[PDB]
Amino acid sequence: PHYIPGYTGHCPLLRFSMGQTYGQVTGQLLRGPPGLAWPPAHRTLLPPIQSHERLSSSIIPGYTGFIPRAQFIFAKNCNQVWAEAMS
Amino acid sequence: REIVHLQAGQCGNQIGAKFWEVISDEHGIDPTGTYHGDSDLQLERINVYYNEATGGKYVPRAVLVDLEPGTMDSVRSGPFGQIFRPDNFVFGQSGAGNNWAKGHYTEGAELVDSVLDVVRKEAESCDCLQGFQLTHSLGGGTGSGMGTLLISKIREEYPDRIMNTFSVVPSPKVSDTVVEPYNATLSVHQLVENTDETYCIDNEALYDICFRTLKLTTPTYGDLNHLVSATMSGVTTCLRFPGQLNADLRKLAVNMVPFPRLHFFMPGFAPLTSRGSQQYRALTVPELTQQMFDAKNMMAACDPRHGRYLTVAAVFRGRMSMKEVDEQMLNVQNKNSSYFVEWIPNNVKTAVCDIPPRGLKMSATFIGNSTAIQELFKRISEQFTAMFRRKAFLHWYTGEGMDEMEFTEAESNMNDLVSEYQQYQ
Amino acid sequence: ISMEEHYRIRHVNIYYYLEDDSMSVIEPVVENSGIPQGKLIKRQRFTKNDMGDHYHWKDLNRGINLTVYGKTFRIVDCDRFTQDFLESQGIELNPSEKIPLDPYTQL
Amino acid sequence: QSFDTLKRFIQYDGKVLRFFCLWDDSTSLFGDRREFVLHYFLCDGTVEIREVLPSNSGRDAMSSFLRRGKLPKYGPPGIYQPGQITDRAVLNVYDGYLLDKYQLGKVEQDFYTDQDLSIGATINVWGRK
Amino acid sequence: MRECISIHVGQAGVQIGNACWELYCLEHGIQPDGQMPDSFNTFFSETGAGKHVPRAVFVDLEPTVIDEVRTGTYRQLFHPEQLITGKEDAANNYARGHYTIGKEIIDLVLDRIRKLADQCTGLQGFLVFHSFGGGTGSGFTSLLMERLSVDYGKKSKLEFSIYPAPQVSTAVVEPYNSILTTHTTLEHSDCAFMVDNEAIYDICRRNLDIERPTYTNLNRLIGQIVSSITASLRFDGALNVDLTEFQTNLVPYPRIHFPLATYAPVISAEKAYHEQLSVAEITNACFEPANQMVKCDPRHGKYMACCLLYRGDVVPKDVNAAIATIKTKRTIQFVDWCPTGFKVGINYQPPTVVPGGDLAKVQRAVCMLSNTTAIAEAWARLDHKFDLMYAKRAFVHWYVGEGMEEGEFSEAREDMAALEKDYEEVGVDS
Amino acid sequence: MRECISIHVGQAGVQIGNACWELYCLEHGIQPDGQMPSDKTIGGGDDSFNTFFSETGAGKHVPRAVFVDLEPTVIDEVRTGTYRQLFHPEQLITGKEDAANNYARGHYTIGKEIIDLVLDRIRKLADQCTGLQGFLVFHSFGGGTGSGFTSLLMERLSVDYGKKSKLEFSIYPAPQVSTAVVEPYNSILTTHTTLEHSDCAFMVDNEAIYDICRRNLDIERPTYTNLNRLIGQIVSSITASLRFDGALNVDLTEFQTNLVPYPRIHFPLATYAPVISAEKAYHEQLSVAEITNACFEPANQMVKCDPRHGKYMACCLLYRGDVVPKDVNAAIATIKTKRTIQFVDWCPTGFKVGINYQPPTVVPGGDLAKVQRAVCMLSNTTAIAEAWARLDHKFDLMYAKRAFVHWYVGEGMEEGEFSEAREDMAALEKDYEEVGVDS
């Protein structure tokens, strides 16, 4: 768990730490922080793994009507919007 | 990359100190200045508005320029006053006293030789400097008069950077100073020439929002500065948060001002909702475009239905879809097309930022450039020239070191500017 | 929908009219609350169940939950006249509760 | 097939297995019983050997006895008729060589392995047991 | 041996390329960390321990669009020296990306381009990815292709673009960038494809049932079109065409290198049970006028040629039936002097599918490349929106102030106006 | 190869298509998911369903039908019914506002928005064809899109397709029972348009099927399910010789050759002979004779018109089941011998015979029994002129004071199309005097 060398961002205690390669300093800093608290729910560095009625079957992709809570779901296929709204 | 935030005046500190209670809650920073946040994007681009000190602490980039020591002593003892470094609270001894010429010429000119030492110090501790800011009101002589002399001498040292000013221009309805038009008419003589940017906020319409749509019985000067601080951060959120589509501070200044004198804008804010009608309100993309664009929700009291939109922004803030955002900017433009200029065939600028303001699921922020900003400038010059035709209060300025021909020189540049808005209408 | 509050606490006065067994619920006026206040429920007999039974003054005590029109009111305290009346009718009153403090109003 | 070295070099770099050696040439006419040392390098499974000389023997100074190389399993093998020792095969010249989809320049040469050698057993070292 | 390096410019060029490189990883066996658990050499270099480095370079001026590739799931896949990043952004200014900030990075990127193509054995194509809206997608791209036009020579340089739409746009300046960038793309690109954002919203709404398509679904459709061109580089076909061979066949003249694209089965996975997906069913869905990628109707056009590219379970006897069908229907009009009219391409490998994507796992697929006279009305629309604002000089003060003369605004108008009559004089019959 | 595309328009036309497609899915072995169960299969090969169904790689059977409607509700019970997966989603087409019982609304204002979608879907069900025997349409004259859009449907099919056959099964209004005030104004104009574009036209009014449900069966209070279940028994028997093998069989162009003598007389009647509840069926012989003269009962015809007032032109016979060819000829010779049945002068043969082998199937939940024989009649009288002497009466009873005319004019319809259609419909009244009188 480290950062790649060209990275242009903020790493705590980086300016005060010295005398190593950049990736080695970032790995050692991300491993632990005696001075402060590192956040628990983080989302930059992630593990690499390869990319009554009305169920999801009871309709067609041209069906007209009201499906509850399915006007706020976006970027998905119509059956997928209906599936993750109903279930 | 990064910005240094100047604050000037008794309005300027009370505008400015609330903004640092706002943007330090973007980044999980407690009042002593230490990060205690809950995500790594609360920390990742924090150097845009900061400098770092020893011990796991960050201090802002701000100087706090006043002409009375008693108006920052409340700011140094607020809830978020001890965050600032006390080296650059550079302050005067005697008062300007609602006087232009005692801020520009006589008294502030001794102080500004010492203000430049720290703003040159905050502008050499950088990586690649991006811009500055300025908070001031166009009524007095501490916020308004020295802040004008501040800008021009920044401009001759750092002439390819970005200057912003967040004005609070004087109102017609009730005036809290007798000599307001002698301030604001000589003031905009250098907001037409010396700055890259300037906004326009009336206190007349900040009252109109805080009674019609927010249902406040009694708004203080804290609830009005909540409205300003939620827009002064909305134009610097592509610069410190990643986006699906990006439009940072330089990208709008090139793109919106069509001609090099017409840089007076009028902002709003979309999810502004009454506390009883928060429950009965849906938040979709059409429910931001419906409330960005309506003439009630402006913060400038210059009615857009009385003129032509020139160039129109929208910096959205949430997790939206790029069709539905681009649909409504097409839908509004085709419905009422008389209100928009026709020799600019699409008056839309769009941006989407992936990190909302905290507590809100979705937001938006608007920057109009309408034709009807001349009715601010015309109605200053109708009540300026009542007083100047008989020379009511002139002896307090002429006795501090300025001539008579400088005022009819200032009435040239303001009454030129009204014509250059009628020219392109 | 609020970023500042997840729930709010609304104080109400419940009036029971011994003349006709009717009830009314009235929110007191609070400065700067921003909500429509005053008469929440008009004077009428409140139904206790789907059978059409009405609330009697015998069903009302400190620390009881009163459910009317899908709202649940926690009875916290009563006035001196109500206390003396219920005790004179042989109802033992529960200890007075404290109204919980509204987080939003405190902030 | 695999022509890869880097994983084994990163995994087993400095590890060798050493066995001392005794060899009775007393069955021959004039040889004495000999003490040798047999190193086995785990980076590439390659073997080297050296002689251990007594206090009173008239043998010259030897820092080796053979080469650090791979030892064949059976006999001094006939790997002659040169050209067959190349591991990869070719189809034409187009230098730039094209890999032939069949494999014709392949001879089954067996080598000693760390699975093969052990304590207290006898092996064949270039025709010597 | 089949070397091909793709350089990405623009924020748009990176989210296009972030979908192509999750497609080329899944198509072969490799993982986000580069390690397989024969023909990857078209797009992957070869290092020691089982790594395969992509043959790419991601260059954009602002830092905030590459920094989630530096921290995303593909940190270790790209070599860090490729992700070139500047400091200050062009900010919707062709002048600022071509004259001011582009001069501080063109020295560095051409070092990485040299360090890639000296490792290569023999090079066919460059695939640059950009968009005709902003600054670094339009200005830096122009400076990139006059360096590459003379530093490298006659290596083929492809060009995947996005045209600005007729109505639905996101800038008020979008005509000004896209009449000054046809000046330099014409003399340097060998084939320049156009796919505008407006038409994909229709196809994502009625063929696929995606109401509200975000740009993640938009860019998962472009990557199928780029991959289907290059499946004949990487795989073995019954009748294959390389990137060199159909550049000859597609363009008549050295100024008419603007083809269209169409991908025929673009079908949701619930409505793909019921359809046969035969070869003659999807050959004519390419020429359906509601399925094109650029908003210009082919019924007003006049076809020069067509480059069908097929992949999957296709047999050449089923191909020649459908080609004879299209030449008999009378709403399709080829020109007088193109009697053959077609360039068949038949491949063996089916198109791979991304999990979390939007399409269906289909046995056959068609990608189509047409060259019509129908794009005369996609360049006579946006040419008016240019000089509607240029007739009294809106937004010229920004462009002049950092390196552009006043005359080059109209030097590129006539080279787009003389561009237009070459499409009038190519469609006439005898 | 013997294919026929079905189209259905309106709330009457959809609810006919439910009863016909529960019939065909049980006539062959189709389950409501779409495929034969692969545990048990009934007899026959691939040939018996390709007139109606399609195929994919997995083995689905998607019907060649499209349902057209102008409101959401009536389609949406097909989409949530037990046959939701058996129909492909684009085949069930649905507008947004219905035509509000106007001919003019469905033909000029609203019908232009769903004529563009429904003409690419036929061209997607006729490109996958190899040889198409002819379309079938299903509508009701009284309705708004069953009258307005359906006339607009037939015209664009005469142009784009040609002489390909277009059958129509229609619902004529009853003589006095009706659900709508406007019904004279629709059935005049829609008869004016569907004259020149339709090839055959089996009109049936609902009041006659009311009378034979209560009498021949015992079912008092019938709904439209019992009305539609008997209609599909007649639609299937027309095409029963296309699908299953017969002793002597007729196709869709066989009866148009024989029934229709002149190019505007194409209005046959309909009679289904054994219509018996299961408590009476097994005590009766039900021979070929007993189900031949029962088609000639004037109380068993399915239009409220009386063939004693008119001349028979040409009668079609559709025999299925346990029918021997030699017993059709015995019962035919009784009819021409009988003297209360009158034929025209210039047609001495007067009969087409069709004999099939497959006996008619039973729908569970239905009311008819399992029988061994049946006869379907397609007569052609001159006595259908009396069902237009009471339609032209109820038209000018309104129209001579201009009632309801402003509702139709303001939809792009000029006022001249009422006087146009009244005279053309009066032309067909004298075409039946002229043809049906003796030389």
User: Is F165 within 8 Å of F133 (Cβ atoms)?
Assistant: yes
F384-438, what's its fold?
Helix Hairpins (1.10.287)
Residue B203 in marked binding region:
yes
Residues of E in contact with B254 (CB under 8 A): 91-93, 96, 398
Residue at which a domain ends, from B222, B256, B290: B256
SS3 F170: strand
- The two tokens of residue F182 are 């406007």
Q: Which CATH class is domain F2-268?
A: alpha beta
Question: How many whole angstroms separate alpha carbon A22 and alpha carbon A11?
Answer: 11
Give the Cα-Cα-Cα angle E135, E138, E140 (nearest 5 degrees): 80
Per CATH, the number for E2-259 is 3.40.50.1440
Question: How many whole angstroms separate alpha carbon E72 and alpha carbon A12?
Answer: 20
Residues of F in contact with A65 (CB under 8 A): 72, 76
**Least CB-CB distance to F60: which of E270, E274, E281?**
E274
Question: How many whole angstroms separate alpha carbon C94 and alpha carbon C83?
Answer: 10
Q: Which CATH class is domain E375-429?
A: mainly alpha
Query: How many other β-carbons are positioned within 10 Å of the β-carbon of residue F429?
Result: 14
Q: Is B330 on the interface with E (CB under 8 A)?
A: yes
Beta bridge pairs of residue D35:
D22
User: Is E420 within 8 Å of E380 (Cβ atoms)?
Assistant: yes
Residue (of E168, E148, E163) closest to E5 by Cα position: E148
**E96 CA to chain A: closest CA distance, Å?**
22
Alpha carbon distances (Å) from D112 to B270, D41, D123, D124: 78, 12, 10, 10
User: Is F120 within 8 Å of F156 (Cβ atoms)?
Assistant: no
What's chain D's length in residues? 129
What burial class does residue C56 get, using C-beta atoms within 10 Å of its C-beta: 0-12 exposed, 13-18 middle, 19+ buried? Answer: exposed
Residue (of B250, B352, B248, B368) closest to B308 by Cα position: B368
Same domain for B108 and B216?
Answer: yes
Residues of E in contact with B262 (CB under 8 A): none
Question: Max alpha carbon distance in chain B (Å)?
Answer: 63
Q: Is F72 on the interface with A (CB under 8 A)?
A: yes
Beta bridge pairs of residue F373:
F321
Same domain for B320 and B414?
Answer: no
Q: Is C36 on the interface with B (CB under 8 A)?
A: yes
Same domain for B99 and B81?
Answer: yes
Under DSSP, the state recorded for D32 is P
Residue (of E147, E373, E91) closest to E259 by Cα position: E373
Same domain for B191 and B90?
Answer: yes
Beta bridge pairs of residue D40:
D17, D47
Concerning whether F429 is annotated as a catalytic residue, the answer is no
CA B417 to chain centre: 20
Residues of D in contact with E49 (CB under 8 A): 6-7, 10
Query: How many other β-carbons are positioned within 10 Å of the β-carbon of residue E147?
Result: 15
- The two tokens of residue E60 are 């954009």
Residue (of F82, F65, F127, F59) closest to E273 by Cα position: F59
What's chain A's length in residues? 87
Give me the phi and psi of F222, to 5 degrees please. Answer: -90, 145
Residues of B in contact with C37 (CB under 8 A): none
Residue at which a domain ends, from B338, B355, B373: B373
Parallel, antiparallel, or unpaired for β B315-317 and B351-353?
parallel
Rg, chain E, Cα only: 21
Residues near F291 by beta carbon (within 8 Å), at least 6 away in sequence: F273, F274, F373, F374, F375
Question: How many whole angstroms separate alpha carbon F224 and alpha carbon F228?
Answer: 6
User: Is F199 within 8 Å of F136 (Cβ atoms)?
Assistant: no
- The two tokens of residue F94 are 């649905």
Residue B141 in marked binding region:
yes
Taken in order F304, F309, F315, F317, the sign of the CA dihedral is: positive
Residue (of F374, F256, F237, F379) closest to F306 by Cα position: F379
b/e code C80-102 from CB counts within 10 Å (16+ = b): eebeeebeeeeeeeeeeeeeeeb
Under DSSP, the state recorded for F367 is -
Question: How many whole angstroms separate alpha carbon F18 and alpha carbon F32?
Answer: 12
**Least CB-CB distance to A44: which of B34, B40, B55?**
B40
User: Is B60 within 8 Å of B29 (Cβ atoms)?
Assistant: no
Same domain for B59 and B159?
Answer: yes
Alpha carbon distances (Å) from A77 to A57, E264, E360, F17, F194: 14, 19, 12, 30, 42
User: Is B369 within 8 Å of B309 (Cβ atoms)?
Assistant: yes
Give me the phi and psi of B201, to 5 degrees please. Answer: -120, 125
Domain that holds residue B277: 264-373
Would you list the DSSP string of E38-52? --GGGTB---SSSB-
Same domain for B352 and B379?
Answer: no
- The two tokens of residue B146 are 């020295």
Residue (of F164, F318, F174) closest to F237 by Cα position: F318
CB pairs under 8 A between A and E: 75
SS3 B53: strand
Q: Residues preceding discontinuities in chain B at C–N > 2.5 Å?
A: none
Beta bridge pairs of residue C13:
C26
Q: Do A48 and E73 touch (CB under 8 A)?
A: yes
Question: How many whole angstroms separate alpha carbon B322 and alpha carbon B329?
Answer: 11
Annotated binding site of E: 10-12, 15, 62, 90, 131, 134-137, 170, 174, 197, 215, 219, 243
Q: Do A9 and B284 touch (CB under 8 A)?
A: no
Among the listed residues E46, E104, E146, E245, the single catalytic one is E245
**A27 CA to chain B: closest CA distance, Å?**
15
Question: How many whole angstroms separate alpha carbon B371 and alpha carbon B312?
Answer: 12
Query: How many other β-carbons are positioned within 10 Å of the β-carbon of residue E89?
Result: 28
Among the listed residues F254, F290, F417, F429, the single catalytic one is F254
**A7 CA to chain E: closest CA distance, Å?**
7
Resolution (A): 7.7
Alpha carbon distances (Å) from F189 to F113, F149, F166, F400, F405: 21, 12, 19, 16, 13
Binding-face residues of A in 4-43 toward F, CB within 8 A: none
Give me the phi and psi of F137, to 5 degrees please. Answer: -120, 155
Tokens 């359809």 -> residue: E275
Question: How many whole angstroms separate alpha carbon E365 and alpha carbon A11?
Answer: 47
Domain residue limits, chain E: 2-259, 260-374, 375-429
Annotated binding site of F for Mg(2+): 71
Nearest residue on chain B to E93, judged by CA atoms?
B254
User: Which residue type is seen at F388?
Assistant: W
User: Which residue type is seen at A10?
Assistant: H
Residues near F361 by beta carbon (within 8 Å), at least 6 away in sequence: F23, F26, F27
Q: Is E275 on the interface with F (CB under 8 A)?
A: yes
Residue (of B2, C55, D109, F109) closest to E88 by Cα position: B2
Q: Is C1 on the interface with B (CB under 8 A)?
A: yes
Residue (of C72, C71, C78) closest to C93 by Cα position: C78
Nearest residue on chain B to A45, judged by CA atoms?
B40
Tokens 């009204």 -> residue: B418
**C3 CA to chain B: closest CA distance, Å?**
4
- The two tokens of residue A78 are 């119509």
Query: How many other β-carbons are positioned within 10 Å of the β-carbon of residue E240?
Result: 16
Residues of B in contact with C2 (CB under 8 A): 275, 278, 359
- What technique determined this structure? cryo-EM
Tokens 């002439």 -> residue: B159
Domain containing residue B306: CATH number: 3.30.1330.20
Same domain for B148 and B136?
Answer: yes
- The two tokens of residue F21 are 């497609």
Residues of A in contact with F87 (CB under 8 A): 60
Annotated binding site of F for GTP: 10-12, 15, 71, 99, 140, 143-146, 179, 183, 206, 224, 228, 252
SS3 D28: coil
Nearest residue on chain E to F86, judged by CA atoms?
E274
Beta bridge pairs of residue C15:
C24
Question: How many whole angstroms separate alpha carbon B29 and alpha carbon B42?
Answer: 9
b/e code B167-179 from CB counts within 10 Å (16+ = b): bbbbbeeeeeeeb
Q: How many domains does chain B have?
A: 3
Question: How many whole angstroms separate alpha carbon E213 and alpha carbon A81?
Answer: 12
Residue (of A36, F369, A48, F376) closest to B29 by Cα position: A36
SS3 E56: strand
Question: How many whole angstroms separate alpha carbon E272 and alpha carbon E358?
Answer: 12
Parallel, antiparallel, or unpaired for β C22-27 and C38-44?
antiparallel
Nearest residue on chain E to B245, judged by CA atoms?
E11
Question: How many whole angstroms separate alpha carbon A68 and alpha carbon A79?
Answer: 14
Give the Cα-Cα-Cα angle E215, E295, E220 (nearest 5 degrees): 25
User: Is F392 within 8 Å of F428 (Cβ atoms)?
Assistant: no
Parallel, antiparallel, or unpaired for β F315-321 and F373-378?
antiparallel
Subunits that touch chain D (at least 3 Cβ pairs < 8 angstroms)? E
Q: Which CATH class is domain E260-374?
A: alpha beta
Question: How many whole angstroms separate alpha carbon F342 and alpha carbon D69?
Answer: 117
Q: Is B273 on the interface with C (CB under 8 A)?
A: yes
Find the helix or strand (DSSP H, E) in which E369 lies: strand E364-371
Binding-face residues of B in 175-214 toward C, CB within 8 A: 214
**Least CB-CB distance to F84: which of A58, A62, A64?**
A58
Q: Is E31 on the interface with A (CB under 8 A)?
A: yes
Subunits that touch chain C (at least 3 Cβ pairs < 8 angstroms)? B
Residues of E in contact with B261 (CB under 8 A): none
Would you list the DSSP string of E266-325? ---SSSSSS----HHHHSTTTS-TTS-SSS--TTSS-B-EEEEEEEES--HHHHHHHHHH
Per CATH, the number for F269-383 is 3.30.1330.20
Alpha carbon distances (Å) from E152 to E5, E156, E157: 13, 10, 10
Residues of E in contact with A27 (CB under 8 A): none
Q: Is A46 on the interface with E (CB under 8 A)?
A: yes
Q: Do F60 and E271 touch (CB under 8 A)?
A: no
What burial class does residue F29 get, using C-beta atoms within 10 Å of its C-beta: 0-12 exposed, 13-18 middle, 19+ buried? Answer: middle
SS3 A9: coil
